[PDB]
Amino acid sequence: KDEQLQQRRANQRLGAEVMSQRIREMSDNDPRVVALVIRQWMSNDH
């Protein structure tokens, strides 16, 4: 079980590291779109 948990953690830490790189390219493409989406998320949270 420990090995499976370690493999899952490595995949999470690899795809998230890829995800963090992915979110940077998108925000550089459109910085205001991310802020608008965040504001919409907060508005829907109400």
Partner 1 sequence: GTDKSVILLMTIGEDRAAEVFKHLSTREVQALSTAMANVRQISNKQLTDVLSEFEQEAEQFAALNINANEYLRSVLVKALGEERASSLLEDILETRDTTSGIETLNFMEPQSAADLIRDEHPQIIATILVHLKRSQAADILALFDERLRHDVMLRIATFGGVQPAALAELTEVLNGLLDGQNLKRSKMGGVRTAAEIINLMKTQQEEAVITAVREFDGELAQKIIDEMFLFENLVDVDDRSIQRLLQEVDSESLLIALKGAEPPLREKFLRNMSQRAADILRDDLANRGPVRLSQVENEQKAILLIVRRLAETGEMVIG
Query: Nearest-CA neighbor of 23 among 43, 42, 37, 39?
Result: 37
User: What is the spatial distance between Cα 46 and Cα 41, in angstroms, rounded to a whole number?
Assistant: 9
Q: How far is the CB of 7 from partner 1 (least distance, A)?
A: 13
Task: Please report, as ranges, the residues that interact with partner 1 according to CB under 8 A.
Answer: 5, 9, 12, 16, 19-20, 23-24, 26-42, 44-45
Query: Closest separation between CB of residue 9 and partner 1, Å?
Result: 7
For residue 11, how many C-alpha atoms fall within 13 Å in the half-sphere facing its CB? 6
CB of 19 to partner 1, least distance (A): 7
